[PDB]
Ligand binder design. Structure first.
Ligand code: HEM
Ligand SMILES: [Ca+2]
Ligand SMILES: [Ca+2]
Ligand SMILES: [Ca+2]
Length: 402
């Protein structure tokens, strides 16, 4: 198994790491900031220092084109992507696709979702028991973002168990063949759904994008259109959930911060920014490929290598954030790499923040006696190189507020 080199040995992507990766991240930052991880499916490098991570995001030698892993005499005949999602592309196709979908995620559009997000959260809360067992992950944190993405896109509620199963396999330590099969089912499902939508459109996003694609296939191809639906669905199932889970947990394990929020509920948006920093939901950005040799902190990563940008690590770098290990919901937030940086910066950043403050804010308002129903040490985390997220969170809700 892998451990940090230097003065302190901490497990890496195994052992104690899943439970609490933060000491390992700190030892990487201090003593091995540009680290090659000899992982089972092949070596992946990891950058953990804030100044390196933030700049890496705008360094074009750090490419999304997986063909950089091939020698040139092998690249000609290969597709640009395994599936034509914009997150797996460089300009110009990235630029074109992002500009197109960005038109549907304008500031005004996402905000007008607040009354509905609030109904959804309020309905979930009303349905939770006072003292019987609750998994706050499956019953609350998971539900909000998934209902929202289904409504935004126009995804049948009756198919929710099929595509949430597919989506989670793609995001965790599943075997590469399992991921391929899940992606296959998700592509076919969404392809068939789009075919049905042509015949009966609705007013939600997938119909709108299908119409753009119908009108102008060079702006958005059919395959690009399915890939976009796939990406938006997976983001709606596997990200915000862990903002909610990690942020709730931060408050449950920090009484002082929970009390400040109780006394000023308007601290919630500042609190959300602090949760995104303190326990980043996307722990490592999806992989980049070195198109040429790059040098960061005195270490050269050769051309052709796979590279993770360590967001959870960088967001606790004391060179950037004083007392990075302290949870302080009152910080005036700025910077941060939890939503990425540059051209691929999170498309759903406004949506995620809104879902987070609504879900966490309304939860603690409604159930001011919420508590964990197990010891902190008993919490099980998912094994993922992409997310920092609880598997389940046993809680006791307590009485509704009067
Ligand atoms: C707290 C929740 C979220 C976190 C922490 C997060 C994190 C990120 C990060 C770090 C990136 C950049 C990855 C990279 O450059 O390699 C990204 C991109 C992206 N995100 Fe988010 N995300 C969240 C929620 C959402 C939501 C709700 C959506 C729904 C629309 C979404 C959709 C996308 C898309 C489509 C991209 C690709 C953007 C592009 O390639 O231009 N995300 N996200
Ligand atoms: Ca119930
Ligand atoms: Ca219409
Ligand atoms: Ca500094």
């Amino acid at each position: 198994a892998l451990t940090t080199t230097g003065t302190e040995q901490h497990d890496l992507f195994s052992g104690t790491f899943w439970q609490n990766p933060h000491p390992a991240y700190a030892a990487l930052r201090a003593e091995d900031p540009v680290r090659k991880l000899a992982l089972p499916d092949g070596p992946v490098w990891l950058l953990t220092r804030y100044a390196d991570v933030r700049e890496a995001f705008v360094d074009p030698r750090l490419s999304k084109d997986w063909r950089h892993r091939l020698p040139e005499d092998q690249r000609a005949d290969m597709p640009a992507t395994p599936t034509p999602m914009m997150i797996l592309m460089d300009p110009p196709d990235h630029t074109r696709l992002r500009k197109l979908v960005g038109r549907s995620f304008t500031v005004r559009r996402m905000n007008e979702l607040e009354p509905r997000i609030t109904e959804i959260a309020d309905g979930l809360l009303a349905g939770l028991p006072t003292d019987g067992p609750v998994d706050l992950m499956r019953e609350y944190a998971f539900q909000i973002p998934v209902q929202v993405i289904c409504e935004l896109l126009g995804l049948p509620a009756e198919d929710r168990d099929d595509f949430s199963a597919w989506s989670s396999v793609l995001v965790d330590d599943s075997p590469a063949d399992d991921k391929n099969a899940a992606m296959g089912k998700l592509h076919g499902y969404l392809s068939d759904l789009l075919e049905r939508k042509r015949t009966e459109p609705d007013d939600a996003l997938l119909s709108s994008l299908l119409a753009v694609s119908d009108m102008d296939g060079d702006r958005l191809s059919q395959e690009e259109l399915v890939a976009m639906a796939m990406l938006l669905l997976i983001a709606g199932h596997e990200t915000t959930v862990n903002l909610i889970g990690n942020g709730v947990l931060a408050l449950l394990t920090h009484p002082d911060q929970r009390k400040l929020l109780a006394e000023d509920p308007s601290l919630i948006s500042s609190a959300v920014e602090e949760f995104l920093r303190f326990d980043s939901p996307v722990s490592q950005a999806p992989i980049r490929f070195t198109a040429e040799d790059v040098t960061y902190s005195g270490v050269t990563i050769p051309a052709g290598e796979m590279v993770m940008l360590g967001l959870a690590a960088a967001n606790r770098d004391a060179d950037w954030m004083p007392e990075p290990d302290r949870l302080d919901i009152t910080r005036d937030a700025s910077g941060g790499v939890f939503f990425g940086h540059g051209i691929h910066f999170c498309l759903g950043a406004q949506l995620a923040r809104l879902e987070g403050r609504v879900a966490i804010g309304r939860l603690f308002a409604d159930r001011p006696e919420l508590a964990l129903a197990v010891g902190l040490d008993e919490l099980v985390y998912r094994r993922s190189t992409l997310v920092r997220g609880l598997s389940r969170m046993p809680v006791t809700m307590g009485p509704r507020s009067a």
